[PDB]
Structures are given as C-alpha cells and as structure tokens.
C-alpha cells in the first residue's frame, strides 16, 4: 500500500540524506565541525557564528 | 647501429681483458663495456674478478659509480 | 621605497616645532620623547616619526628647513 511505499527509499548516507539547516538545499554543504549549512548560507552567517577573516 | 654486446667472454675477448685493461689509467665498467663490446654486468663481474686477483686497484666504490685504476 | 607619507612628515614637523628643546640627534631618545609628548596609536608609526625627527634635527643642525 501507499503507507509502505511513501518515502520508502533508504536515505541514510547519500546527498539525499543531508540538507542545509537553513535553506534545506542539498548542494555545497559544509559538514565540517557540524555546521551542516550550504556554502552561501555559511557566508551569510559566518560573522554571527564567529568565523572571521584574518588572512 | 644497435650494438650487440656479449654476455659472457669468448677466448679472444677474455684475452685483451687480462693484458690491456690492467694498463688503463681509468678502469670503469662503462669504459670496459665500450672498449670490449661487452655488457655492463659482464664488465662489472670481470673487474671484480681482476680486483680479486690483485691486478687492479680500487679507487672508489659506490652504488652508482665504481672506479678502478692500474696497479702501477 | 622608503618614502615617508604626509602623516609621518607633518607629525614630525609639528613635534619638532613644539618640542625642539627636548630633541636631539639620538633616535632612541627621540622615540621616547615622541611617545611621551604625543599619542601615536602604533609602534611602527612612532618609529617612523622618530626617524624623520632625527633626520630633520640633523638638517636643522646645518641651517634652516622650509617646513
């Protein structure tokens, strides 16, 4: 039935199992240090997070 | 063009190895190889045999370059 | 290029015109004098100003200076 079919494909490792915590996009994601945000969202929120440019 | 060096001596080339190589100012496996038309392995073996017999003096030994000279 | 900027030169000129008595030909005394009588927020800028002050002291030693 539809209950056993809907979203039944395993999503445990690939890019289909990860997304931006801000915009829910799946591309250019930064998993380092547990940020789990895409590149653009990280550039947007880097100063708030505490990442600042020195060199 | 393609040189055809020997892998083991014949009596003619085993000769001219026991009375001219001991007279060269510089004895090297490449020099003997070129002047006797023999392979580098055979040249090295022959020079080691000559040195064992005391006819050649070892000047320097290295993994890439071994130099012998006449006993005079 | 060791060309000093107008910041260094005007600061040195004002310092010399104001405190000519306290200054001399010594860089290491001049820099202390500058750091005592002035407010220079950087050490490198202070050193540049003191060096130009020393140069100008030598210049006034053998005559006048237009600044």
């Amino acid at each position: 039935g539809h209950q056993q079919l809907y979203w039944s494909h395993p999503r445990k490792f690939g890019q289909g199992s990860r997304s931006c915590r801000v915009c829910s996009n799946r591309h250019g994601l930064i998993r380092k240090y547990g940020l789990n945000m895409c590149r653009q969202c990280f550039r947007q929120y880097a100063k708030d997070i505490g990442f600042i440019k020195l060199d | 063009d393609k040189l055809n060096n020997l892998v083991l001596f014949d009596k003619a080339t085993y000769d001219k190895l026991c009375k001219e190589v001991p007279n060269y100012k510089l004895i090297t496996p490449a020099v003997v190889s070129e002047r006797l038309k023999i392979r580098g392995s055979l040249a090295r073996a022959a020079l080691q045999e000559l040195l064992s017999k005391g006819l050649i003096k070892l000047v320097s030994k290295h993994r890439a370059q071994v130099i012998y000279t006449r006993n005079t | 290029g060791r060309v000093r900027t107008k910041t260094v030169k005007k600061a040195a000129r004002v310092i010399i015109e104001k405190y000519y008595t306290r200054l001399g030909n010594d860089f290491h005394t001049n820099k202390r004098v500058c750091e005592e009588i002035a407010i220079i927020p950087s050490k490198k800028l202070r050193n540049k100003i003191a060096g130009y002050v020393t140069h100008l002291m030598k210049r006034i030693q053998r005559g006048p200076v237009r600044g």
Partner: protein
C-alpha cells in the same frame, strides 16, 4: 688544510685570466670542504660571484625536472669525476675545472640590433660574470646530453667534458658552442 671533499687543495690553483679572477672563487676564503653550503647568494645582485665555483657547478647539475633539488646526488656526481679527472690527467681537478671555465666562456656574441632593430644582430662584448655563467651552463649541458641514453655514466661524461674544455679540444660541446657564438658575432660585426 681545507681541501675539498678531503683530498683536493686549492693553494696550487692559478686562474691566470685576470679578467675572470674576481669571478671564480676557489682560493682562500672560498676553500670549503663540501660544495654544499645552503647559502643566500641569489638575494642581492652579483653575490653569486662569492659562491665557490664547485658549488655553482653542483647547482647547475640539477637540471631537466627529474633532478630538481637533488643536490646530494650532484655533489656525489662532482666528487666522482673529480676522482676521475685526477686519474685521467694527473692534475688537480680544481685546476682542470678552472681551465675549463676559462676556455668555455664566450667573449663576444650578438644581440638584437644595437639601440633598436628587428632584422639582424649586432656584436657585443660579454661580462665576466656572464662568461662564467655561460661556461658552467655549457659544460653541464654537454655532460648531460653526453650521458643521455648511454651506458657511459654521468661523472664520466662530465669528467671528459671538463678535460676537453681544459685542453681546448673541439671534442667538447662547450668549446663547439663557444666557437659558434664567437663566429656569429664575428659575422655580425
């Protein structure tokens, strides 16, 4: 008592060229045990004239990509072929190298036309430093392409190249190239 490697003195080496005496450094402050000194001779212009000539040769040996930076291999390749120059000639290898440097440096060569031009070449004189540089470069190149695809090892090709250049023989690649350059300069006089 600062013999190179541990065997070659310098007290007997005579430059005897006057022109290149100030640019070949071999004799008293430039007597060192090894042709490896790290050194910062490229920092200011003309300083490389203070570099010992054997170290300049050693540096010029590291060439054609696969041998870049391998200076221990090149000091070995100089230590050998000094051991071989001594056997072949009976003279101090340093003297042979210095004579080769003197003989293999061009004295004239051609540049693009004079003040300006885009058609022919005009002959000019060579600086002593450029003479020494070109001599080292030519000697090293001749050795390098004598040893390529040949059972003759390096430190044998370089030894024979230096010996021929010291003799002034035309069997040397450096002497041939020097003559070619000098003749072209003659034609464009």
């Amino acid at each position: 008592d600062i013999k190179l490697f541990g065997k070659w003195s310098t007290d007997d080496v005579q430059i005897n060229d006057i022109s290149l005496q100030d640019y070949i450094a071999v004799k008293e402050k430039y007597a060192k045990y090894l042709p490896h000194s790290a050194g910062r001779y490229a920092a200011k212009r003309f300083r490389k004239a203070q570099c010992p000539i054997v170290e300049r040769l050693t540096n010029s040996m590291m060439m054609h990509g696969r041998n870049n930076g391998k200076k221990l291999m090149t000091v070995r390749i100089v230590k050998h072929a000094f051991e071989i120059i001594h056997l072949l000639t009976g003279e101090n290898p340093l003297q042979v190298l210095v004579n080769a440097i003197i003989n293999s440096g061009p004295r004239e060569d051609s540049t693009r036309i004079g003040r300006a031009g885009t058609v022919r070449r005009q002959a000019v004189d060579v600086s002593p430093l450029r003479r020494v540089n070109q001599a080292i470069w030519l000697l090293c190149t001749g050795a390098r392409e004598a040893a390529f695809r040949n059972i003759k090892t390096i430190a044998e090709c370089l030894a024979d190249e230096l010996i021929n250049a010291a003799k002034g023989s035309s069997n040397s690649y450096a002497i041939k190239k020097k003559d070619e350059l000098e003749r072209v300069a003659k034609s464009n006089r």
